[PDB]
Design a protein around this nucleic acid. Structure first.
Lengths: 1094, 251, 363
DNA sequence: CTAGTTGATCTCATATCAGGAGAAGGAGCAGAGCG
């Protein structure tokens, strides 16, 4: 058996469905977005969207509709999963806590049935008397709702029309009436049935069948004043109410088919319609007294290619795209002088269909960096993805041993931090940093003969300084020191803390509380505590008055984070931490919900607790180990909120997103100290002090994965990296219509240089395929080599062949003519990139599409339609066949390791081929004889072959007389994503190997091998987390990860869902203790942390 | 109230009186009704089978499950226990109309009028086996819902006129109450199982050849051991075959 | 097709689209196998074939000489040309060989460790596939024309047997009970087939020109009798309501089990709504058959549906729901007795009176 | 009216070579006669 660990590096980003309604509360307007397995609940504010919850379904969300049963206060959510788990979910918020309770659940799969072509349709009666599901041909599954089920017992009604295109429930009908477009051999017709829940059968509909357009594909139920339906077809929009039959054939909608729609109003006087090109139309119903007088369609503008779109309010439309970035657009009443009313407000990153990718160690670091062909037709792009915050440094000053950083506004009028005070060993150094100029000057009011433990700007246009002996309150406006407080015993200050109003200093084992007032430093609260002081923070949070009411301390020999009551310095709460290393940093910070107290040790351990403004009680202890060196935490307010920077040998930006603490890495060497800085020239900038210098950089976003976007405006298909040439070869495809004309300026049409394929070998809308050479620094299209008319560039490999030293871009193509089903012609072109031009070094006309190429020990291994052949690169610079293998249906995927070739077939699924070099021919080592339709293949080890099935499954084959020719599927796992690419590499600097993969939905996942010991341990934990974690639809994890195909279903095996394991950190201590019944929990934290690092 | 699998409710006050085995029998009777198959309440004499039938019919009419709830049922019993059935029905479920088709009777008009009235009123017609033989022309023209035969072992002779008469009822819901549904040989069992569920035990020749000769011939004193094992084999086969439709509780 | 691959990669089309479209294209390109062969061991015509439902690797074949051959269809060799070798054989030297022609052989569903074979020697034998010994025998008073186990029953394990007797026998694998019979036919029951959709629904076709659907749990005879006209020629049910104008010698439920294909000796195939037996009036033209015994024909699965009917010495491929004639697979030298469809790779195996099993593969 | 007694009648159940002659049908061949 094989042991594999699958984890999600990037959650899916493609939006397959969105609905709006009052889900989170009766007064709120929610936007619920289904990304493949993630459900995102947003609240539609007057500006943007404020996320409230993001839950992960154990299922691909196929249907998602909000409905309000009689008596319900707020909307319930119906979700159907691709595996046919139906659930009705309610949002129950109990104060701070947010829950998604499963009001009902079930599994609605018929044991047999032809899953319908058009796909799962799920509709709800507008009076919530039933949910209709069209899952299979010839059946219409009904889940009644007036009968309060908890199991959603569902019954089939035999639907005599076997090919139903779309169906909706009509409005204003005494009984639940479905209206559906169906296809029979005589054409497409719209028919209506009334569903009788008591007779559990259909009845004659209100209005007879009507013969409609040949491609009538969408039905819109129109609300109560009008009723009836609007059938959208390819060329016409028709309206039916039983006697009224309006029809328009707007020429403007003929260019592309309308794929999503949405009702802007409640009475349906206006509908948004999105087509496959990204146009957005408004369909208007003009009423007459009420009946409907006439229909109008007008083109609002352009958006991302919408899968779904939702009208929120005030003209704001959420454009849900599977192929591009989703957009949040606005509808203005008037045009923008270019004919468009659509104005994009926001863009949500979507690594669209990741069709190919490579991990390049670009920037010559030790870190991989994915470069993905993301997106599609108009939305095509290259996305560059790395696990780093991105220092983005602008200046530096070589000052050694900087143990203190504080921003200062030396100029009184300016509110900007245009000065920085620094402490090194025993003195104070001021820096002016005026604009971009940086210099070392002395500021009035600061002692240069004593160290600065702390200093900062305070209220009353005042500064304050805490040195090792005294505290000096600098009156910036009038003159030098006027208020100074000195410890009565002339004891040195061991720790300091201060905010905009007050002060707390530690002298030995005693604490002093000082409050800053104009020309006054008044001591109020004082005590001499049990042990020495270690670290402090009194930063007010949610201040609202001018003073912080609480205090946080760290003590010696009783290693613990204590809390104190500020006016009296009594002991509020104690959490014991332990260890032989004293606390170093203590900070309290708001992270998106409430107050958290972050305390760290000298070994990189760091503890975050949930703190309250009344009691000051630390709850939900969770511990996280970052770094191997002491840490300090500094607060900086970015655009969105405050984010804390853990300064250590492993600097990390710790912030909270979606009401959870996620830690982002910073990828420089080391950071002793940091402080925020917003100078006239440096906005929201940082100042990272290390042992040597002070780097002054900003950080772009802190999302763990930084995603650059290189818009191509054309569908990219393949990508390979040529290091010697410092470029990416990207096969792209753009759609031109007519001789031919580009519909838009794509990256291929806007290259520096260009060229066209002039080949002597072979003698509506069409796809033009190009080879783009893209600079790997600036990502500009250095060159665009257009391929022949009707030539599809499929594969692209970069390699050096034979013995010549040149590195070649080798493209495999096929000739596509509409008269044929399989290319009979294709060619392999060898290009060399030099002098900014792309010369054609060689060609080889082959007799099929070259679906895949891999360079194979200096030889070229191509897979023409069903044959896999090996080419040799002769000294003459031409490709010469060496050996063939013909035993394939269609060799689509090829991988290589040494002498072994893994051939993924279209439907025979893997064949381990070996090139036996002494003879010069291939030999079938083994084959997996199951009929798995591959989407990709990979080689993990000398004897493990990963494959991705087209039914969203991963399987591992393993080299096992004639039964030695049977590869054994020792691993099985339902991923839920359609994997397009595997590739060795990892995005970061216990587990063996690392295979990344990209999916159609934008998931980037990572497969790695575990050992048997680790695998057994984690499988047992996996079972217990299933016993503890409660899934949203009460779906079983085992069922979710069960290998699933229409003719097979097995429980997973040999695979660890790393996602489920890593959820082990997101649970409270009692539940964790329940998980770890039969070694201690902190040990498993060691394991799961070590696992999350990969 | 007691709620069974799909829609069957028997009233709580009525259910409480029944013993554990009696309500198990009611459960079994309604499972048969769901299967639209007949059965034999083989519980021995005195264990209570009139009460189980009365409770099941009361729950069937009460539960409102052509016929809404309970249709017109006919109960064929020996002449000495007709008024016994009337008394039990009146005491246990007084809502039922329970008429006797017999010379004693209560009608005082043409009998055929009584059968018509009970058929069109969804009442319970208690009759004798002799009357079923005699009035088979009229008794089977009305689409009865239940054809309970009390002491249905009277149907044991497959060629008796009473058996051929009782096997004319079209309904699937055929029930026999008899604490001894086998008295002389396996032909009797075949006759009873032909009445309740015509198909399970096949045609009488086939049942003879497959069960009667093997099972009987292996019980004789001079039986060879191989023949004894064959009889054991056939008896086990037959027991498994008749298990779902025979409910026989001992004392 | 590169359009299909591109749409699958870009998510434009569900992979279901490519899978079923390519399955249909493969079935349309069915042709005599270029590089495949099947080992010849039957001395007489092959009356029946059955590929196991799970893993689709092994194939049973019953010959008119009474032998039962078990083939491995997988190409365990490295060449592109291979012969489907015979793994096992109930030959003439086996102690339990059928004395007369084997007319139906069927793998046990849910497990390949057992199969069954019925012969004109009036026996339905249940064989352990591992030891290759008869686990059980069910003797009948009259010759068996066909038998079928339910491909769906996790609960019951009944074998429906149609003999020249007018009764459909139901032989229970559990507690060996062959006494159960269904009454309502009048002549030899030439075909029987369990519904793939409904557990207890059995369709039986007999020489009385009638097809009856039974709920075997029920005590009240057949559920539906198929009628050509659906009521145009309506008469009290004694001789009317015939499925065909001849002997109905073949049954086949469609893949979903929502329709039933009946072939009769009136040179007609008909498609019936399996829920109420209504004739769908799909034409199919003239389907030549004159077989005096059961005719075994199968339907395709996992395609964008086809039916492969023996048609003289050929295989006629029709579209089930339109009736349009796809093609004639023409490679047999005598009348074709059976064809069995491998759904994994859209392959076909046809047995005929010429002592040959021919494999048809997509080109 | 109206129940109780009296006879007839039916069902059901209890084991263990030394004829001959003629008439009606079917069979195979032969030819005639026409498309």
């Amino acid at each position: 058996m094989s042991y594999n660990y699958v984890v999600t590096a990037q959650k899916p980003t493609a939006v397959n469905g969105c609905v709006t309604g009052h889900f989170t509360s009766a007064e709120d307007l929610n936007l619920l977005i289904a990304k493949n397995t993630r459900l995102e609940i947003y609240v539609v504010t007057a500006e943007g969207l404020r996320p409230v919850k993001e839950v992960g379904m154990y299922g691909k969300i196929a249907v998602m509709e909000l409905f309000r049963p009689k008596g319900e206060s707020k909307d319930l959510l119906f979700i159907l999963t691709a595996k046919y788990n139906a659930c009705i979910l309610e949002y129950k918020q109990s104060g701070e806590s947010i829950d998604i309770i499963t009001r009902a659940h079930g599994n609605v799969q018929d044991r047999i049935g032809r899953p319908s072509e058009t796909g799962i349709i799920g509709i709800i009666d507008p009076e919530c008397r039933m949910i209709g599901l069209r899952l299979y041909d010839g059946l219409f599954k009904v889940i009644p709702l007036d009968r309060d089920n908890k199991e959603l017992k569902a019954f089939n009604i035999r639907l005599e029309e076997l090919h139903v295109i779309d169906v909706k429930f009509l409005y204003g009908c005494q009984a639940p009436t479905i209206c559906f477009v169906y296809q029979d051999p005589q054409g497409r017709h719209v028919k209506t049935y009334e569903v009788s829940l008591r007779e559990k059968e259909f009845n004659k509909g209100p209005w007879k069948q009507e013969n409609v357009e040949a491609e009538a594909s969408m039905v819109i139920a129109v609300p109560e004043p009008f009723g009836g339906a609007i059938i959208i077809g390819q060329e016409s929009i028709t309206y039916h109410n039983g006697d009224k039959y309006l029809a328009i054939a707007p020429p403007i909608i003929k260019q592309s088919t309308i794929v999503c729609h949405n009702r802007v109003d409640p009475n349906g006087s206006r509908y948004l319609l999105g087509d496959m090109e990204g146009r957005l139309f408004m369909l208007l119903l003009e009423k007459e007294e009420v009946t409907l007088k006439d229909l109008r369609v007008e083109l609002l503008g352009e958006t991302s290619i919408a899968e779904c779109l939702t009208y929120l309010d005030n003209g704001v439309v959420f454009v849900g795209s599977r192929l591009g970035d989703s957009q949040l657009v606005k509808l203005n009443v008037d045009s923008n002088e270019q004919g468009s009313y659509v104005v994009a407000m926001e863009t949500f990153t979507n690594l669209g269909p990741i069709v190919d990718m490579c991990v390049v160690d670009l920037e010559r670091q030790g870190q991989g960096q994915l470069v993905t062909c993301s997106g599609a037709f108009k939305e095509g792009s290259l996305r560059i993805i790395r696990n780093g915050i991105g220092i983005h440094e602008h200046a530096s000053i070589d000052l050694p041993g900087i143990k203190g950083l504080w921003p200062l506004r030396s100029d009184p009028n300016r509110e900007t931090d245009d000065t920085l005070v620094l402490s090194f060993v025993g003195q104070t150094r001021v820096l002016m940093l005026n604009g971009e100029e940086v210099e070392e000057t002395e500021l009035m009011g600061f002692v240069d003969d004593q160290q600065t433990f702390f200093c900062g700007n305070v209220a009353h246009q005042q500064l304050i300084q805490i040195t090792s002996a005294s505290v000096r309150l600098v009156s910036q406006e009038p003159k030098a020191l006027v208020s100074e407080w000195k410890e009565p015993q002339a004891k040195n200050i061991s720790v300091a803390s201060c905010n905009s109003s007050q002060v707390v200093v530690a002298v030995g084992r005693a604490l002093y509380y000082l409050q800053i007032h104009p020309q006054e430093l008044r001591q109020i609260s004082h005590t001499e505590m049990e042990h020495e002081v270690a670290c402090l923070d009194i930063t007010p949070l949610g201040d609202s008055n001018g003073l912080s009411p609480l205090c946080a301390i760290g003590l010696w020999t009783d290693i613990s984070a204590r809390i104190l009551k500020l006016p009296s310095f009594e002991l509020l709460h104690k959490e014991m931490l332990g260890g032989e290393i004293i606390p170093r940093s203590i900070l309290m910070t708001t992270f998106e919900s409430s107050h958290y107290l972050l305390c760290a040790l000298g070994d990189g351990a760091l503890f975050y607790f949930g703190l309250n403004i009344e009691t000051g009680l630390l709850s939900d202890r969770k511990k996280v180990t970052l770094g191997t060196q002491p840490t300090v935490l500094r607060t900086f307010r970015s655009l969105s909120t405050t984010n804390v920077f853990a300064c250590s040998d492993r600097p990390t930006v710790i912030y909270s997103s979606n009401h959870k603490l996620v830690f982002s890495n910073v990828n420089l060497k080391e950071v002793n100290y940091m402080c925020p800085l917003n100078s006239d020239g440096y906005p929201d900038s940082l100042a990272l002090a290390n042992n040597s210098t002070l780097t002054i950089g900003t950080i772009d976003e802190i999302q763990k994965l930084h995603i650059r976007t290189v818009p191509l405006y054309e569908s990219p298909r393949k990508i390979c990296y040529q290091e010697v040439s410092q470029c990416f070869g990207v096969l792209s495809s753009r759609i031109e219509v007519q001789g031919t004309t580009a519909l838009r300026p794509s990256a291929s049409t806007q290259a520096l240089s260009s060229s066209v394929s002039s080949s002597k070998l072979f003698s509506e809308e069409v796809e033009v395929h190009n080879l783009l050479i893209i600079d790997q620094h600036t990502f500009e299209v250095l060159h665009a080599h257009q391929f022949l008319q009707n030539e599809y560039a499929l594969s692209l490999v970069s390699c050096k062949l034979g013995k010549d030293p040149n590195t070649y871009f080798i493209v495999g193509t096929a000739m596509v003519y509409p008269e044929e089903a399989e290319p009979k012609q294709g060619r392999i072109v060898v290009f060399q990139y030099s002098d900014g031009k792309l010369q054609t070094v060689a060609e080889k006309e082959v007799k099929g599409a070259v679906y895949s190429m891999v360079e194979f020990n200096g030889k070229l291994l191509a897979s023409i339609n069903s044959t896999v052949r090996l080419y040799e690169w002769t000294t003459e610079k031409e490709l010469r066949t060496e050996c063939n293998h013909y035993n394939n249906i269609m060799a689509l995927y090829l991988k290589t390791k040494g002498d072994f070739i893994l051939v993924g077939d279209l439907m025979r699924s893997v064949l381990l081929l070996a090139y036996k070099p002494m003879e010069g021919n291939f030999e079938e080592i083994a084959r997996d004889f199951n009929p798995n339709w591959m989407s990709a293949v990979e080689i993990l080890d000398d004897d493990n072959f990963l494959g991705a099935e087209n039914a969203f499954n991963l399987f591992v084959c393993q080299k096992d007389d004639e039964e030695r020719q049977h590869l054994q599927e020792v691993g099985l796992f339902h991923l839920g994503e359609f994997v397009n690419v595997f590739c060795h590499g990892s995005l970061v600097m216990p587990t063996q190997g690392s295979v990344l993969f990209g999916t159609v939905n934008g998931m980037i996942g990572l497969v790695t091998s575990l050992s048997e010991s680790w695998y057994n341990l984690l499988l047992d934990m996996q079972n217990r987390l299933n016993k503890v974690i409660k899934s949203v639809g009460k779906i079983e994890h085992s069922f979710w990860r069960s290998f699933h195909t229409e003719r097979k279903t097995e429980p997973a095996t040999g695979f660890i869902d790393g996602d489920l394991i890593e959820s082990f950190l997101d649970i409270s201590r009692p539940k964790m203790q329940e998980v770890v019944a039969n070694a201690t929990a902190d040990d498993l934290i060691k394991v799961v942390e070590e696992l999350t690092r990969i | 109230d007691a709620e069974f699998d799909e829609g069957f409710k028997v009233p709580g006050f009525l259910f409480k009186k029944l013993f554990k085995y009696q309500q198990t029998g009611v459960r079994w009777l309604w499972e048969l009704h769901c299967q639209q198959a007949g059965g034999i309440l083989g519980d021995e004499m005195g264990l209570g089978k009139t009460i189980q039938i009365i409770a099941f019919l009361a729950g069937l009419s009460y539960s409102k499950i052509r016929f809404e709830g309970l249709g017109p049922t006919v109960i064929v019993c020996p002449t000495t226990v007709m008024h016994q059935w009337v008394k039990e029905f009146h005491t246990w479920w007084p809502p039922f109309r329970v008429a006797i088709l017999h010379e004693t009777g209560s009608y005082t008009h043409k009998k055929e009028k009584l059968i018509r009235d009970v058929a069109h009123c969804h009442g319970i017609l208690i009759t004798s086996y002799s009357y079923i033989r005699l009035m088979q022309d009229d008794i089977s023209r009305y689409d009865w819902h239940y054809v309970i035969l009390d002491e249905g072992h009277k149907i044991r002779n497959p060629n008796a006129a009473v058996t051929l008469a009782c096997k004319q009822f079209r309904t699937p819901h055929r029930i026999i109450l008899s604490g001894s549904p086998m008295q002389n040989n396996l032909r009797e069992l075949w006759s009873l199982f032909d009445f309740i569920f015509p198909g399970k035990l096949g045609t009488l020749p086939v049942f003879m050849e497959q069960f009667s000769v093997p099972i009987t011939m292996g019980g004789y004193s001079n039986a060879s051991p191989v023949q004894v094992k064959t009889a054991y084999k056939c008896a086990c086969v037959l027991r498994d075959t008749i298990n779902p439709y025979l409910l026989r509780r001992m004392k | 097709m590169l359009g299909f691959l591109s749409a699958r990669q870009t998510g434009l089309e569900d992979p279901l689209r490519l899978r079923r479209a390519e399955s249909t294209r493969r079935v349309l390109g069915l042709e005599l196998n270029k590089d495949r062969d099947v080992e010849r061991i039957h001395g007489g015509g092959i009356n029946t074939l059955d590929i196991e439902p799970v893993e689709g690797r092994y194939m049973l074949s019953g010959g008119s000489d009474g032998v039962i051959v078990l083939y491995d269809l997988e190409n365990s060799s490295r060449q592109s040309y291979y012969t489907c070798k015979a793994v096992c054989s109930i030959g003439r030297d086996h102690p339990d060989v059928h004395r007369y022609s084997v007319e139906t052989v069927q793998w046990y569903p849910h497990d390949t460790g057992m199969f069954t074979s019925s012969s004109f020697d009036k026996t339905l034998k249940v064989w352990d596939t591992n030891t290759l010994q008869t686990a059980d025998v069910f003797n009948f008073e009259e010759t068996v024309y066909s038998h079928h186990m339910s491909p769906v029953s996790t609960k019951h394990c009944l074998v429906a047997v149609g003999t020249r007797g007018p009764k459909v026998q139901l032989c229970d694998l559990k507690s060996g009970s062959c006494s159960h019979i269904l009454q309502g036919h009048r002549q030899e029951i030439l075909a029987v087939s369990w519904s793939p959709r409904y557990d207890y629904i059995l369709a039986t076709a007999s020489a009385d020109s009638r097809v009856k659907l039974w709920d075997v749990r029920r005590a009240s005879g057949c559920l539906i009798t198929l009628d050509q006209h659906n009521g145009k020629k309506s008469q009290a049910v004694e001789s009317a309501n015939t499925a065909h104008n001849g002997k109905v010698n073949g049954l086949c439920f469609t893949s979903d089990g929502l329709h039933l294909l009946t072939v009769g000796t009136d040179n007609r195939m008909r498609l019936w709504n399996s829920s109420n037996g209504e004739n769908t009036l799909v034409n199919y033209g003239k389907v030549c058959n004159n077989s005096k015994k059961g005719l075994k024909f199968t339907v395709s699965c996992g395609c964008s549906e086809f039916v492969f009917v023996p048609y003289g010495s050929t295989i006629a491929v029709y579209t089930v729901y339109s009736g349009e004639q796809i093609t004639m697979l023409k490679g047999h030298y005598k009348t074709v007795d059976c064809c069995v469809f491998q759904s994994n790779f859209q392959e076909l195996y046809s047995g005929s009176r010429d002592c040959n099993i021919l494999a048809w593969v997509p080109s």
